[PDB]
Design a protein around this ligand. Structure first.
Ligand code: CLA
Ligand code: CLA
Ligand code: CLA
Ligand code: CLA
Ligand code: CLA
Ligand code: CLA
Ligand code: CLA
Ligand code: LHG
Ligand code: BCR
Ligand code: BCR
Ligand code: PQN
Ligand code: SF4
Ligand code: SF4
Lengths: 742, 135, 74, 141, 31, 80, 34, 155
């Protein structure tokens, strides 16, 4: 079979008839409400397209149209951010003085007293200081004025409307068949070549011609108005050759493989730019050129209409071995017939990738004047770690939904999925053991330290001045990274990051990046991280492996993915569903990532960030107290939570007062979650009975009868408010501390 | 009992020490063909053409398995209780007819000849062996 | 909050794997339980969680009350 | 009245707060006009105007005027909602008309709702305000 | 300062009396 | 064991017997309804107590009730 | 001079009373006699 | 190229898998000749060897990590800690014995456990032996560490 385009013309007519029919998509919701449960079921089932239809082709058409709608709203968001940078911003004042103007969009309208939020953010401007780092991104793009931002935002609005029209079009006018979607080899070839490689090659073209000359003239310190417009680097080639002399040879050393001529603008410098604290733009251009060539080559692996290439089915069927039976026979049919299986894989690995992106962008700061902006460095790290954790829990949810709905025992017969099902007790009991071991020997060491320090016995602590736990392996790896330029990496000048070694790089008196030394407190907190991830993995993997059955409830897959219980019998069977494991794992994901971002914040403020003396002495923000206070719980209470929340609670009557308001409002939402978490719905339904009596008395009872929330909805609301309140608390705390001390 | 054990490579989900010490269960069925089903302990197995015999830890496992043997249109499944004395008793169906169908010779057990709002108060039955639901 | 938020059937399915691991491990095979390990019951868990909640409530406030007053006034 | 309530116009802390008044709106004299309006309230020793809610007519604007204003608007909203639910319980599918509003039924009701006290008193005296205790459901005692 | 040692030993020997009486009451309440 | 009772508001729709995951219930002949059958619970020693029977029962305020009681190996649903 | 009593009673109350109490109660709740 | 993971006893119905970790001839050699499972031993002989080894290793963490590990009394405090914990273990074994305990289980690795661990008297003989072995193993670890300077000095 060949990859080709077959399209149904006009499947679904465009009409507003069904907008007047709420819940037209489900056959049980189309009858209309009798209780208020109907209203919540309309939203829980709105995007559950397996419950809409049973046909995979219409499911796939719905998914492909809804993606264009989502791309439309994301492009509206991005063009909105660029429009605010165009109009309501101090971006042009920030370009002239990147070290003393604080980045601001979002002017606040003067009404009931709220114009106190328009702080003195510098550059002759009042507004809310932003921490999203858009200023640095537009700086690294080489944008020099507001008009280019207006052009970019108008083009983003056009592109968003174009996505929205494409979503109308591929559901109502020209909708693809089922076999158009199942050309996974064609889609992988096109994504790896065009969507990644051609995109990275065009971006390397922009970086070579627009971003690097303009940022090089900025680092020379010319002016914002004397730097020419970037089409005058294409028309007048002498402006390139004055900056980058490798352009004098033209395109002839590219085709004759004399690539060392291009070493002016395709460097391998390694470290950071000493003017901006960012990565070298020639390193970034060279990165995208290499990555583009690798992606274009990689997108030729898979067989399409011309015989050459691979069947992914034939690759997966050959990777069996003596331990794993049939190997990966059947996994191709799982991933080509189940959208939930694909969403599980892409959601898990996209979340893992965002956590990698967060770890990479603090230590190797890409953007000009990003590393000295400690507010942006804290906020984008924590933001992408939260996006990572949520997407990983989503991948676990959709793995369990695959296992309940789309799992076929005939396809998955003595393969690696069938073999992990058939020894799930061994996997889960060893993970149970691992989690208990990691808990005792991570947290119990903190409890030991608390008790020894409180009992007046600090010579018995696990610390650097007592019983030591040095991270010998991580120290060894950082030594190998410090010694890589000239040694294992001979064509690198400076190390990849200064986090491993190489010395303090100061920009504007502040530390951009310096070596992050690892000791007993760092040993302890990395095992806290290992513990909390393993427990989260225990909960989610247990919910995926036991989604269909356990020893307790054999026919669990008949009950569904999402169900409250199977009654008070068998001792009580509450929260056995895979959904309930996603529920319980969201809290441990929260626990883990809160400790990750707290580790980050206090390790950076204690041991990296700070002001550099003119001699060369580094004076950190919290003064190096991580080594002796991050080893007890009392230290993390006092010296981190009590000491650094001084700026969010003293923030009233100032420009940071919305952060104190969000701090208290988030504690409110957090505590308000616990009414839903700690209770059950029999109480609430019985209270609604007496309130419905008082309405029947005054003839105000509604025909849509009031019901308490379902057991699943009560759990969902409880975890949504718990996460919302806790994350917004840490958000307001981080913002109000790091906009004041850094 | 008679039957061939279905073809699968074993699991950690199967029979534990409860089987050799207090109770073990077994389900037998006859299949027109060899076909893949899902074990109650997790995993794919193949039933044989002809009679089968699969041991299970609990009675509920065999009722879930016989519930998915309705989907293959196999309705002659029998469940046996097996004690460590070797004593095998036939439990389901116990009458020979499935319990969904009315068969004669079946007597009422635990029927109350009243509606449920007509139970006595707990204080009316206090300090005696009887409960409010007992007759 | 563990006993108040996580409910029973999770823990019962987890204890079943711990029972498997104990009965399949060598030398630990030599001993086992006279009473079968089960998860706490639903009411029991409400009891234990509320007991924890209120003991922690009382001890946290009594530590703060005593210490904040007696560090200022003896 | 109680706990050092001087007038605002005589309180030195009020006069000290009025010099550093923040502007509420874009009007450059919102703070000055705010303290000139608040100068007739009673004032604690910290400078802030305290309100008196016991019902005396010297301080009717503190709580008595907003009470009448709220109770009128809240009775409007509640009486209009009661009238709409009673009007739709006869039109052959009541539950569908609660999520999809009949504007031709609701909008004359929200126009009519200005006279909810007279309508409520006529509803009360005619025995149409309440249902009987034998007519509406209860649970076993 | 405090009380003498003999008073402490007398208090302990006297506390043997409600200990024995509490043992007898707790065993009698059990049956 | 647990106790499973049946009251005379039964209409014999057989749904509790179909809902039962451990074969506690069965249908016996009767003359008290149009379907001419009741539920009966002879195997209450196999009752796990999961109350699927009460969920399946359609009569307003159930014709079948489970009264939870002394817990055994079968009623706790233990495979060990 | 009766402060030596604490070095008897606190280790008794911390180790000897728990071990004897738990040992009796373990053997009692597992016994099939009473 | 062939399968390495099997059901135990060629019956797939038990909660059992013969794996390389479970049923290697080297692993089955080692577990079956551990004194818990070695043929030809009385319950006293099993408890005595188990006790000797446990007292010997349990000397270590008390001596090198305890409160007195930097004092001159470090090794004797470690000996007293190991002997106290051996005595607590003996008390636990005697409570397990006198509770009329359940029988020891065969597994994939051990086809047949000894009859020592099937009754109350075999466990009581085991615990009586475990006490003696434990105190002896802790004492021999105490003398080999506290006199390790002299033993190196003899060379
Ligand atoms: C998607 C991201 C996004 C976000 C969060 C914002 C946020 C904001 N914009 Mg904005 N904007 C965006 C995209 C975005 N914009 C885009 C893409 C453009 C280009 C078209 C603009 C152009 C723009 C201008 C020109 C201005 C703002 C302004 C504002 C601020 C106040 C808006 C306000 O009060 O509206 C009022 C909100 C309403 C009237 C709500 C309408 C309610 C309807 C009925 C809801 C519809 C529901 C239903 C279907 C009917 C606020 C910070 C203003 C600025 O305030 O600050 C000084 C301003 O002047 N924006
Ligand atoms: C999608 C990527 C992309 C695009 C559109 C361009 C586009 C262009 N490049 Mg170019 N270039 C690129 C990537 C790209 N480059 C990369 C990756 C390198 C490094 C190998 C170069 C190195 C390069 C040199 C050295 C020169 C150009 C030149 C040119 C211009 C004329 C090309 C020509 O004669 O035909 C044109 C604006 C020429 C020019 O006049 O530059 C302004 C020129 O001399 N390019
Ligand atoms: C993903 C990587 C991966 C890893 C870590 C292993 C690991 C292992 N393989 Mg292996 N294997 C793999 C992929 C992998 N395999 C693939 C893709 C194939 C092709 C189907 C095989 C085919 C294979 C064979 C044929 C054998 C191993 C064997 C082994 C074991 C090594 C020999 C030993 O220690 O004794 C070891 C556990 C050997 C073994 O121990 O099997 C009993 C052996 O004979 N492997
Ligand atoms: C690419 C991302 C992605 C996609 C496409 C889906 C898609 C889907 N998921 Mg899913 N999921 C994701 C990520 C994703 N998920 C993540 C990250 C998690 C982990 C939390 C989950 C966890 C999850 C569960 C646990 C379940 C699904 C389910 C579903 C299906 C139906 C959902 C529905 O109808 O929406 C309904 C959506 C709503 C009613 C909106 C809920 C409101 C949210 C929770 C509040 C957000 C707060 C806001 C951001 C901040 C405050 C704003 C406020 C103040 C205004 C659908 C296939 C369900 C299913 O059965 O699938 C078959 C199901 O039970 N998902
Ligand atoms: C038609 C609207 C309406 C009316 C007249 C009443 C009337 C009453 N409610 Mg109420 N209630 C309503 C809607 C309404 N309810 C809704 C929608 C809810 C769910 C949120 C409740 C939930 C509720 C509770 C939980 C309680 C009452 C109670 C009461 C009584 C005391 C007053 C009070 O506490 O108000 C408080 C009511 C609220 C805070 C609900 C908010 C009211 C909404 C916002 C306005 C509704 C207007 C409607 C949507 C507009 C339709 C107009 C039409 C033209 C389309 C009184 C009989 C109490 C009682 O029994 O005391 C004896 C009590 O405990 N109510
Ligand atoms: C409330 C009663 C109580 C009492 C009186 C003690 C008393 C003691 N504990 Mg202990 N402990 C208790 C409860 C108690 N514990 C609880 C509930 C916990 C759990 C949190 C701990 C956890 C704990 C740890 C983790 C450690 C102690 C240690 C100690 C010893 C302090 C060091 C020292 O001076 O001896 C120095 C030690 C010696 C002179 C040798 C040990 C002598 C004893 C009496 C053994 C003799 C047994 C004998 C052969 C029969 C001391 C004997 C330390 C210790 O030394 O333990 C061995 C130690 O490491 N305790
Ligand atoms: C759970 C983590 C943890 C750890 C590792 C420690 C560790 C320690 N504590 Mg401590 N403590 C903790 C939690 C912890 N504590 C908590 C939660 C409290 C409660 C407040 C205390 C209260 C406390 C007190 C009061 C004291 C200590 C003391 C000590 C030290 C000596 C204890 C000793 O002799 O151990 C004895 C250990 C054993 C008998 C067994 C060790 C376990 C072995 C090594 C496991 C080996 C498994 C092996 C790898 C498997 C083999 C496989 C096989 C095939 C070969 C030691 C450094 C004492 C001290 O002086 O501090 C320096 C002391 O006085 N602790
Ligand atoms: C989910 C995360 C898993 C990590 C858990 C870690 C410990 C758990 C181990 C449990 C034993 C599982 C039994 C395996 C199942 C089993 O049958 O084993 C046999 C299996 C090979 O099986 P076959 O040879 O049949 O496989 C052939 C086909 O299956 C296709 O490969 O070998 C393993 O994979 C062992 C290696 C796992 C070791 C993990 C290495 C992790 C590498 C980390 C690299 C990180 C970056 C490092 C940079 C420095
Ligand atoms: C930011 C943004 C935006 C913009 C964007 C843009 C502006 C883009 C562009 C893009 C581009 C502009 C791209 C391009 C690319 C290119 C490419 C990708 C090319 C390549 C080529 C090649 C591959 C070559 C080939 C060859 C060879 C190799 C040799 C032989 C010959 C030839 C030449 C054929 C918008 C508005 C949307 C919205 C908002 C945001
Ligand atoms: C196998 C193996 C292993 C392991 C090892 C170990 C685990 C060991 C142990 C070891 C030990 C743990 C040892 C022990 C020893 C002991 C001894 C050496 C003892 C002795 C004792 C004695 C001799 C005593 C005696 C006595 C006395 C003196 C007095 C009186 C009493 C008595 C008689 C008892 C590893 C992993 C590495 C690797 C692979 C292989
Ligand atoms: C508080 C609580 C409730 C009570 C909450 C309920 C009944 C839902 C909340 C009421 C909604 C928000 C009322 C919405 C009514 C109208 C939509 C309001 C319209 C007003 C207009 C101005 C829009 C539960 O039902 C419940 C169920 C299961 C476990 C825990 C709990 C639980 O903790
Ligand atoms: S307490 Fe609630 S969730 Fe738990 S078994 Fe009962 S009804 Fe189900
Ligand atoms: S509670 Fe469960 S086992 Fe018992 S009769 Fe009802 S459905 Fe059957």
């Amino acid at each position: 079979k060949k990859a080709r385009v077959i399209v149904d013309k006009d499947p679904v007519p465009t009409s507003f008839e069904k907008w007047a029919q709420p819940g037209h998509f489900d056959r049980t919701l189309a009858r209309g409400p009798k209780t208020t449960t109907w209203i919540w079921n309309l939203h829980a089932l709105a995007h559950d397209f397996d419950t809409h239809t049973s046909d995979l082709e219409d499911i796939s058409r719905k998914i492909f149209a809804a993606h264009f709608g989502h791309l439309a709203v994301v492009t509206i968001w991005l063009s909105g951010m660029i429009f605010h940078g165009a109009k309501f911003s101090n971006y042009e004042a920030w370009l002239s003085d990147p070290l003393n103007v604080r980045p601001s969009a979002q002017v606040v309208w003067p009404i009931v007293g709220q114009d106190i939020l328009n702080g003195d953010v510098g550059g002759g401007f009042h507004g809310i200081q932003i921490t999203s780092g858009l200023f640095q991104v537009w700086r690294g793009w080489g944008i020099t004025n507001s008009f280019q931002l207006y052009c970019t935002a108008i083009g983003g609005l056009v592109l968003a409307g174009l996505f929205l029209f494409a979503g109308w079009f591929h559901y109502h006018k020209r909708a693809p068949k089922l076999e158009w979607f199942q050309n996974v080899e064609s889609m992988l070839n096109h994504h790896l070549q065009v969507l990644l490689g051609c995109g990275s090659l065009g971006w390397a073209g922009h970086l070579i011609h627009v971003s690097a000359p303009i940022n090089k003239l900025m680092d020379a310190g010319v002016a914002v108005k004397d730097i020419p417009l970037p089409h005058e680097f294409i028309l007048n080639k002498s402006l390139l050759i004055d900056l980058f002399p490798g352009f004098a040879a033209g395109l002839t050393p590219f085709f004759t493989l004399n690539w060392g001529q291009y070493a002016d603008f395709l460097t391998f410098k390694g470290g950071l730019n000493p003017v901006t604290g960012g990565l070298w733009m020639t390193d970034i251009a060279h990165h995208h050129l290499a990555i583009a060539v690798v992606f274009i080559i990689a997108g030729h692996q898979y067989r399409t209409n011309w015989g050459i290439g691979h069947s992914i089915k034939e690759i997966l069927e050959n990777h069996k071995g003596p331990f794993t039976g049939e190997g990966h026979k059947g996994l191709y049919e799982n991933l080509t017939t189940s959208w939930h299986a694909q969403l599980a894989t892409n959601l898990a690995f996209l979340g893992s990738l965002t956590i990698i992106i967060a770890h990479h962008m603090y230590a190797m700061p890409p953007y000009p004047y990003l590393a000295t902006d400690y507010a942006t460095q804290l906020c984008i790290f924590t933001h992408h770690i939260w996006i990572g954790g949520f997407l990983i829990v989503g991948g676990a949810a959709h793995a369990a939904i695959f296992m309940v709905r789309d799992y076929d025992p005939v396809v998955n017969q003595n393969n690696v999925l069938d073999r992990v099902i058939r020894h799930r007790d061994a996997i889960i009991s060893h993970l149970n053991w691992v989690c208990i071991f990691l808990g005792f020997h991570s947290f119990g060491l903190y409890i030991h330290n608390d008790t020894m320090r409180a009992l007046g016995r600090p010579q018995d602590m696990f610390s650097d001045t007592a019983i030591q736990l040095q991270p010998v392996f991580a120290q060894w790896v950082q030594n190998l990274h410090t010694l890589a330029p000239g040694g294992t990496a001979p064509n690198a000048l400076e190390p990849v990051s200064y986090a491993f070694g190489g010395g303090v790089l100061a920009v504007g008196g502040k530390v951009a990046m310096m070596p992050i030394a690892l000791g007993t407190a760092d040993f302890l907190i990395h095992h806290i991280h290992a513990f909390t991830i393993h427990v989260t993995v225990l909960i989610l993997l247990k919910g995926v492996l036991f989604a269909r059955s356990s020893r307790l409830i054999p026919d669990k897959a008949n009950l569904g993915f999402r169900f409250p219980c199977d009654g008070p019998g068998r001792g009580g069977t509450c929260q056995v569903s895979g959904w309930d494991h996603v529920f319980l794992g969201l809290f441990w994901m929260y626990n883990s990532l809160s400790i990750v971002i707290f580790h980050f914040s206090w390790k950076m403020q204690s041991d990296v960030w700070g002001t550099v003396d003119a001699a060369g002495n580094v004076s950190h923000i919290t003064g190096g107290n991580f080594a002796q206070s991050a080893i007890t719980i009392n230290g993390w209470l006092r010296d981190f939570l009590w000491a650094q929340a001084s700026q969010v609670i003293n923030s009233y009557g100032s420009a940071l007062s919305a952060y104190g308001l969000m701090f208290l409002g988030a504690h409110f939402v957090w505590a308000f979650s616990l009414m839903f978490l700690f209770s059950g719905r029999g109480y609430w339904q019985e209270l609604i009975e007496s309130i419905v009596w008082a309405h029947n008395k005054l003839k105000v009872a509604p025909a849509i009868q009031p019901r308490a929330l379902s057991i699943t909805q009560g759990r969902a609301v409880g975890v949504a408010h718990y996460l919302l309140g806790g994350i917004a608390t840490t958000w307001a705390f981080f913002h109000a501390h790091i906009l004041s001390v850094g | 009992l008679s039957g061939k054990t279905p073809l699968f490579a074993g699991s950690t989900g199967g029979l534990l020490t409860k089987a050799v010490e207090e109770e073990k269960y077994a389900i037998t069925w006859t299949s027109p063909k060899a076909q893949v089903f899902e074990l109650p302990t997790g995993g794919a197995a193949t039933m044989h053409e002809g009679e089968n015999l699969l041991y299970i830890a609990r009675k509920e496992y065999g009722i879930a398995l016989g519930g998915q043997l309705r989907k293959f249109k196999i309705t002659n499944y029998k469940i046996y209780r097996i004690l460590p004395s070797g004593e095998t008793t036939f439990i389901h169906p116990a009458d020979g007819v499935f319990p969904e169908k009315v068969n004669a010779g079946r007597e009422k057990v635990r029927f109350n000849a009243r509606s449920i709002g007509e139970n006595p108060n707990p204080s009316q039955v206090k300090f005696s062996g009887k409960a409010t639901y007992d007759a | 909050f563990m006993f108040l938020i996580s409910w029973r059937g999770y823990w019962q399915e987890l204890i079943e794997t711990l029972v498997w691991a104990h009965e399949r491990t060598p030398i630990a095979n030599l001993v086992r339980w006279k009473d079968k390990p089960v998860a706490l019951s639903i009411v029991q868990a409400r009891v234990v969680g509320l007991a924890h909640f209120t003991v922690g409530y009382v001890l946290t406030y009594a530590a703060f009350l005593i210490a904040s007053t007696a560090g200022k006034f003896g | 009245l109680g706990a050092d309530l001087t007038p605002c116009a005589e309180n030195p802390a009020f006069q000290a707060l009025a010099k550093n008044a923040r502007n509420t709106t874009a009007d450059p004299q919102s703070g000055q006009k705010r303290f000139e309006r608040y100068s007739q309230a009673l004032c604690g020793p910290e400078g802030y105007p305290h309100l008196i809610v016991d019902g005396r007519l010297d301080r009717a604007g503190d709580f008595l005027i907003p009470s009448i204003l709220f109770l009128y608007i809240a009775g409007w909203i509640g009486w209009v909602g009661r009238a709409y639910l009673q009007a739709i319980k006869k039109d052959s599918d009541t539950e569908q008309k609660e999520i999809q509003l009949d504007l031709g039924i609701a909008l004359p009701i929200i126009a009519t709702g200005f006279a909810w006290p007279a309508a409520a008193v006529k509803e009360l005296l005619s025995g149409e305000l309440t249902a009987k205790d034998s007519e509406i459901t209860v649970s076993p005692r | 300062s405090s009380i003498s040692d003999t008073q402490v030993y007398i208090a302990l020997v006297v506390a043997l009396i409600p200990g024995l009486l509490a043992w007898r009451l707790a065993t009698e309440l059990y049956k | 064991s647990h106790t499973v009772k049946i009251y005379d508001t039964c209409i014999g729709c057989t749904q509790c017997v179909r809902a039962c995951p451990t074969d506690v219930l069965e249908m016996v002949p009767w003359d008290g309804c149009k379907a001419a059958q009741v539920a009966s619970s002879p195997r209450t020693e196999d009752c796990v107590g999961c109350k699927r029977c009460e969920t399946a029962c359609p009569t307003d305020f159930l014709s079948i009730r489970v009264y939870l009681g002394a817990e055994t190996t079968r009623s706790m649903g233990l495979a060990y | 001079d009766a402060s030596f009593l604490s070095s008897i009673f606190v280790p008794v109350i911390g180790w000897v009373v728990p071990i004897a109490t738990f040992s009796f109660l373990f053997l009692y709740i597992e016994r099939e006699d009473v | 190229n062939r399968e390495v993971v099997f059901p135990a006893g060629r019956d797939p119905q038990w909660g059992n898998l013969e794996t390389p970790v479970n049923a290697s001839p080297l692993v089955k050699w080692f577990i079956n000749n551990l004194p818990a499972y070695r043929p030809g031993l009385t319950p006293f002989r099993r408890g005595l060897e188990v006790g000797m080894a446990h007292g010997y290793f349990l000397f270590g963490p008390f001596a090198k990590l305890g409160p007195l590990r930097d004092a001159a009394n470090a090794n004797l405090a470690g000996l007293l800690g190991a002997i106290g914990l051996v005595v607590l273990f003996t008390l636990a074994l005697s409570l397990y014995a006198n509770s009329n305990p359940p029988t020891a289980l065969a597994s994939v690795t051990v086809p047949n456990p000894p009859d020592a661990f099937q009754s109350k008297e075999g466990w009581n003989n085991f615990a009586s032996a475990f006490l003696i072995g434990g105190i002896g193993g802790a004492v021999v670890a105490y003398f080999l560490t506290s006199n390790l300077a002299l033993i190196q000095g003899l060379v």
